[PDB]
Amino acid sequence: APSFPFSRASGPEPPAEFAKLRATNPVSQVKLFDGSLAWLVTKHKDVCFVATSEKLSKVRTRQGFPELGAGGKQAAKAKPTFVDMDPPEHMHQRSMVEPTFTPEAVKNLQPYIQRTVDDLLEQMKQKGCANGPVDLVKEFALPVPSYIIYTLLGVPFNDLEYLTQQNAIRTNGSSTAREASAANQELLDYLAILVEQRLVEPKDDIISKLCTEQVKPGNIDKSDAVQIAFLLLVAGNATMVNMIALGVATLAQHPDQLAQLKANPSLAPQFVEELCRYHTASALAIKRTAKEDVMIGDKLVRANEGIIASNQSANRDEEVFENPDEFNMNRKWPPQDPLGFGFGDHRCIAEHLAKAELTTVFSTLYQKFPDLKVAVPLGKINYTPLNRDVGIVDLPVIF
Ligand code: HEM
């Protein structure tokens, strides 16, 4: 049994093992960091089964749950939020915050998403690149999703820049254990205060809704509100950052499609679709422990054994997606849903918000900066360490 997670084959590519497993051993066992074992599922159809089977559980206190890191080990012990719940508790809590993420709600947010994007692009225009390239991540990729989720949660405008920096420290590969843990507690302390505040006087934000609708009547307590809010903040912010960066680096490698996008900005939606499939920046979230013996393909997963379903590998499953290893936004899509945001009840609560943020980014960026280009050789792009989810740390560009 090989050690999992695997390292990416190279900068922007998925681990090399997936293609091989998809071909001759779709369901196999891997060894985790503590030496324990877990089953690895690689085919699209099987990944979908793992995500919807009622015989599988996301409860981390269960025997055999696949924690991938020592941190995961300790993290599993605390009080769980909906991300780690099974029905009926799952939707009972998730339904408490889902209203803000529906298509209708997201469509109502467009003017705000657009405004936030325009504001950050304008500040880049005013700053310029006369003396050299600027960092697309720091100046755009990072703040766009950060400012948006913080605002939605309820964070006042004046505190966005500081809190955006602190949250980044949580996942900066440069950060140290001490520092990461500190920023982590700092954010929780801040959110605990925000909650008391909206408890006194609610405004139009997610925390206020939780305070009026769930805390006051006693359905959940303040600490729970703090935890749910923290989950919404950290679940996909770093992912949004990498997706925006990978999107710009990808277009830099595909001049013909980039020309299509500049010619017609309305192709942003279809560009985002191929992007979320091609670059699955969140690949280790579909994990389960079997509640009873369950068969997957030609393998029997025993009750209490762990399972990791790779949506990244699934999105490269040739049997589903023709020519899966080539970025082509003009591809003929099959009836099977790409799995960038998961599948089943747990499917990313912010899928609609995420796609709307990405779409706004790619239908605007090149309209604002038609001559926007990566300033470093694409081969020298600074991607995240190969042992982590695909992403980009910094990205010099000129315009
Ligand atoms: C393009 C960026 C994003 C990508 C690719 C992404 C992907 C995912 C994936 C693959 C899952 C696992 C789904 C499953 O269990 O089947 C997930 C879960 C989740 N995401 Fe995201 N996500 C993104 C942005 C966000 C954002 C911006 C938020 C917050 C506002 C967010 C909040 C969540 C939450 C709360 C869950 C857990 C849902 C549950 O278990 O019920 N995600 N996301």
From Swiss-Prot:
EC number(s) on file: 1.7.1.14
Family listed: Belongs to the cytochrome P450 family.
Catalyses which reaction(s): nitrous oxide + NADP(+) + H2O = 2 nitric oxide + NADPH + H(+); nitrous oxide + NAD(+) + H2O = 2 nitric oxide + NADH + H(+)
Outcome when changing residue 72 to A: Decreases the NADPH-dependent activity
Inducers of expression: By nitrate/nitrite.
UniProt keyword annotations, A-Z: Acetylation, Heme, Iron, Metal-binding, Monooxygenase, NAD, NADP, Oxidoreductase
Source organism: Fusarium oxysporum (Fusarium vascular wilt)
Outcome when changing residue 389 to V/L: Impairs catalytic activity
PANTHER family: P450, PUTATIVE (EUROFUNG)-RELATED (PTHR46696:SF6)
Pfam family, one: p450
Residues that hold heme according to the record: 348
Protein name: NADP nitrous oxide-forming nitric oxide reductase
UniProt enzyme class: oxidoreductase
Activity regulation remarks: Cyanide, CO, and oxygen strongly inhibit catalytic activity.
